[PDB]
Design a protein around this motif. Structure first.
Motif: not given
Ligand SMILES: NC(=O)c1ccc[n+]([C@@H]2O[C@H](COP(=O)([O-])OP(=O)(O)OC[C@H]3O[C@@H](n4cnc5c(N)ncnc54)[C@H](O)[C@@H]3O)[C@@H](O)[C@H]2O)c1
Ligand SMILES: NC(=O)c1ccc[n+]([C@@H]2O[C@H](COP(=O)([O-])OP(=O)(O)OC[C@H]3O[C@@H](n4cnc5c(N)ncnc54)[C@H](O)[C@@H]3O)[C@@H](O)[C@H]2O)c1
Ligand SMILES: NC(=O)c1ccc[n+]([C@@H]2O[C@H](COP(=O)([O-])OP(=O)(O)OC[C@H]3O[C@@H](n4cnc5c(N)ncnc54)[C@H](O)[C@@H]3O)[C@@H](O)[C@H]2O)c1
Ligand SMILES: NC(=O)c1ccc[n+]([C@@H]2O[C@H](COP(=O)([O-])OP(=O)(O)OC[C@H]3O[C@@H](n4cnc5c(N)ncnc54)[C@H](O)[C@@H]3O)[C@@H](O)[C@H]2O)c1
Ligand SMILES: Cc1cc(CNC(=O)c2cc(CSc3nc(C)cc(C)n3)on2)ccn1
Ligand SMILES: Cc1cc(CNC(=O)c2cc(CSc3nc(C)cc(C)n3)on2)ccn1
Ligand SMILES: Cc1cc(CNC(=O)c2cc(CSc3nc(C)cc(C)n3)on2)ccn1
Ligand SMILES: Cc1cc(CNC(=O)c2cc(CSc3nc(C)cc(C)n3)on2)ccn1
Lengths: 249, 267, 264, 261
Positions: B1, B3, B31, B242, B246-247
């Protein structure tokens, strides 16, 4: 297994379910954060709005123009999160400018008492909130405020644009102080959100477009800053504006 | 799970285990990302380094000055990830400037052939990579390049600073094209990191260039409200991840500063 | 009793009487300056200026022209005399790099040629001329604000971003001679080439795109913007060549009607 | 034959002969301008200072926090320059921040009443002055204010830096209004100037390092004792030689802001 799992985060600025803070709070809860909310004046109304969030969160009163509210804030937050616990994040999503300073009113017709009130709430309070909350923040923590790119003048926004230029400066000084606690301070510069020509130009300039009716991309950006994924960014501005500010036409 | 769970990401620019791209690749794999790596010239040497990453990843040759490598790149990537699959991310971590264009050599003594080579590799290639890879990128995808804040002039960096100013401009045009595919394009402006060439310049390989770099590095950690560790590429690798996530879905043609906040402070 | 009385100034970049450099040269002569012109057929255009000035050949891509430039200028202004000012008003980008051609379809050989002429040459000119410049001297180049991307300008925008960076490094070197280095960022000017685009030389689609870009400038500018008038730009260059901005260097002065300060 | 020959210019902000406004007034008079001066509170003291200028000029009282002074300003200027005459230039060289907002005091310990007073005088008054004076300005006119580059935070300047960030934004809005009169509005961002051990050892050393970094960064150096290059830059903006620049900032800082080291 969320982006903000186990993080304790204070979120200010909910007034309606269209408030950017409402969307920030919703996304943070979806991502595993434990929230503390602050509201101004219409607390019963705000409590009813907070019932629309996926999880229950304590609501504290905070009028940023009230020095007694600011003096008691850390103790009230500590009571809400429990003694021995500290905050990992703070969201400043507060802004105000009287009608004389933002809208159709000529720029020159805004009296200083109105402008001062707007600057107090929209810019100076970012420093007040950080002063009150840094003593109860964990290292690696994050303070995020909301901005509207004021680098170029534009119709109607007038003194609110001036207040945002002051906010950007305040954010750089707050980062100096927050750094002593191992805490980051940053602003998210959002495109216009429905909480006409100037606004429509945004979707045109934005290489990926801009939906003024959707606060979720802005809420996601705030959560990215609250996370451990931008650990070397402070005193800075992240633009969640569809890239509009990078294009002339 | 993680990023970047299930994301297919191309990472260019690994030469040593000190390369920013090595750390980007490591964090992305930690990630959950499935990588495709690209290397230049020293492929056997790069394969030995990429063996040190947590997961195995195909290594493809890519000289950005080679038209044929660029023309075949999409096909070679598709073969590596499988027909019907597309990339979700692209990392440009490529930079070069000949010795005449950096360090102690006077700014005025850099011949244009050397400057042009440096600009080709460090700035123009960001557009070449995007041109080759956008046809094989999924909507919601992300292209990330590496920058070094060139807003103000500084000693020794000379023409590399000029190349970065050109790169920032190229990024804004790449964003216009990438937008048509529902793809974002952004740069991460990092503070100084002790990679292969940075360590050599700091060690004086001229006295002046190293002393100026020394003062520049010392000032960075001083100016940064949260400090700056030149020996640690992980904060920079995290920032790139980052942007690959999708952030940050509404950020494009932009620059994210992973520099300890140094560029926001005068002293 | 002019702004540039007794100053010896080199002006590059005249090709037609619509060239920004033609207007800079004209205003400088009106203000008492003694000029040396450089060109790359130009003599019949330079003869249209109010005063006679020597014309020297200078191809900025030619290393021999650059190596001999100071010597040739000294011969033109007389032994014992030095330059007080230098104007770089040179720019070029092939059709593959600016106009209708997609941004991605510009080959590097074309982009590199454009960058050589438009950005690197600002450093070449300063290297050649600083040894023959007086303290308090001034080097000025021409810019087009490249802070934000825009249609059609494409790789010329990239070349201007590089030029702004070059200017900051040139200021470091020029400072050693007590010389300032700055750029004037002009709004769009209806030069021989620009008037053709408006007329329809680029076609219907891009011709309309460029027209919106141009109408927008006059709209955004609080004092308006007249694309057909290069005189406000020439005056701004002369202000930088004068003794009236003595503490400005490595900088950009915007002669754009204030358009870059406004969103709408 | 001066740069400002025949121009009628209002200059605010003289308090001492070290004031940047004193040097702006002096250079403008040397360049043929006819001045109108405005002073705050200590008018008798100001008159003694303005006697040191090369030419005599009327002195008007102007407290920018006083709405009555602002309401009567245009009429009083008109009386000083003669009916039928208008101003060609306006210089705003006014700044104030209490000791709680600038100096040794922690950034967080500045009360809002002090910050608001500082913002009123240092930023909002640029708009008040333009509102009062634009109706008596000629086309081709120029409004100039004084700035200190607030793009990056720095020690001690604290809330004065915040006030300058606000001022830069105010200038962009003033340019929109001034444009309707064919008038330009710009700021001159100066390097530090020694105007009139007081801060202690710690703060005194940090401020000295900050101030000395300017001369080091500046490719042409920076003389902290000398306001003349700043005064000349203001006069360039008051002249007809920057006719297409508005809502903008001209840096008279030795080029320090363009260099990292
Ligand atoms: N809406 C947009 O287009 C847009 C664009 C960019 C940035 N922003 C910014 O985002 C933030 C949130 O604004 P929004 O659009 O969600 O509007 P909103 O009206 O929903 O939120 C503003 C909030 O400020 C609060 N507030 C006002 N006075 C206060 C006081 N004295 N003490 C404490 N809180 C006080 C209000 O109660 C309200 O919750 C603001 O900083 C705003 O400037 C908004
Ligand atoms: N190291 C720093 O201080 C610093 C600071 C900010 C940004 N950056 C940037 O980060 C990126 C990576 O640099 P690094 O510090 O890891 O150095 P590095 O030496 O480890 O990586 C640079 C890479 O560029 C590659 N490259 C050079 N020519 C090439 C070509 N023709 N085709 C393809 N690839 C080519 C090299 O093979 C190498 O893998 C660069 O863009 C650099 O400018 C570095
Ligand atoms: N809208 C505009 O026209 C505009 C806007 C802003 C800035 N500028 C800049 O102003 C400058 C002058 O452009 P212009 O509009 O007057 O056009 P122009 O075509 O009249 O001037 C460009 C000049 O560059 C010269 N040049 C090209 N290659 C050369 C070489 N190898 N060696 C020497 N000189 C060479 C040409 O001979 C010509 O004199 C350029 O730097 C341009 O980018 C123009
Ligand atoms: N001194 C520097 O290092 C420096 C650097 C950059 C910019 N500046 C700016 O230049 C301007 C002049 O500052 P200075 O250094 O000459 O200092 P100064 O103290 O000599 O001038 C400030 C002036 O503001 C006036 N003022 C204060 N309150 C007022 C009020 N209520 N109404 C009207 N006027 C009022 C004072 O009477 C004084 O004449 C300011 O805007 C300042 O911020 C100064
Ligand atoms: C009583 C009254 C006041 C107004 C003016 N503005 C606000 O109340 C107001 C609302 C807000 C939320 S903050 C904000 N910030 C930006 C950048 C844009 C928007 C729309 N709101 O701030 N000020 C108009 C009508 N009636
Ligand atoms: C003998 C010799 C040759 C060189 C030539 N340049 C590189 O190898 C080179 C490597 C790189 C990596 S990219 C980069 N980017 C920045 C911002 C700084 C540095 C040092 N490297 O760039 N140029 C240098 C030193 N000594
Ligand atoms: C029809 C056409 C022709 C070309 C070839 N380049 C020039 O004519 C040329 C002229 C110049 C002068 S510099 C310049 N700079 C700016 C910012 C705008 C313009 C029009 N010219 O540079 N390139 C390119 C595109 N379209
Ligand atoms: C000991 C002490 C006293 C004060 C009171 N304010 C002033 O004297 C004062 C003078 C001025 C003139 S404006 C100005 N502007 C800049 C950018 C720098 C300076 C020194 N003065 O403003 N405030 C403040 C700080 N420390």
């Amino acid at each position: 297994t969320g982006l903000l799992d186990g993080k304790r985060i204070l979120v200010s600025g909910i007034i309606t379910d269209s408030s950017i803070a409402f969307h920030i709070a919703r996304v943070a809860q979806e991502q595993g954060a434990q929230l503390v909310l602050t509201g101004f004046d219409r607390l019963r109304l705000i409590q009813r709005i907070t019932d629309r969030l996926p999880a229950k969160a304590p609501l504290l009163e905070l009028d940023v123009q009230n020095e007694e509210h600011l003096a008691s804030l850390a103790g009230r937050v500590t009571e809400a999160i429990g003694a021995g616990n500290k905050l990992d994040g703070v969201v400043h999503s507060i802004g105000f400018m009287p009608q004389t300073g933002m809208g159709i009113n000529p720029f020159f017709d805004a009296p200083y008492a109105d402008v001062s009130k707007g600057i107090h709430i929209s810019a100076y309070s970012y420093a007040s909130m950080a002063k009150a909350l840094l003593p109860i923040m964990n290292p690696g923590g994050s303070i995020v405020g909301m901005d509207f790119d004021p680098s170029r003048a534009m119709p109607a926004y007038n003194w609110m644009t001036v207040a945002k230029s002051a906010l950007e400066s305040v954010n750089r000084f707050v980062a100096r102080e927050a750094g002593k606690y191992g805490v980051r301070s940053n602003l998210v510069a959002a495109g216009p959100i429905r909480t006409q020509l100037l606004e429509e130009g945004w979707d045109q300039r934005a290489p990926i477009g801009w939906n003024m009716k959707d606060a979720t991309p802005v809420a996601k950006t705030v959560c990215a800053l609250l996370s451990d994924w931008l650990p070397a960014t402070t005193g800075d501005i992240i633009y969640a504006d569809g890239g509009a500010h990078t294009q002339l036409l």
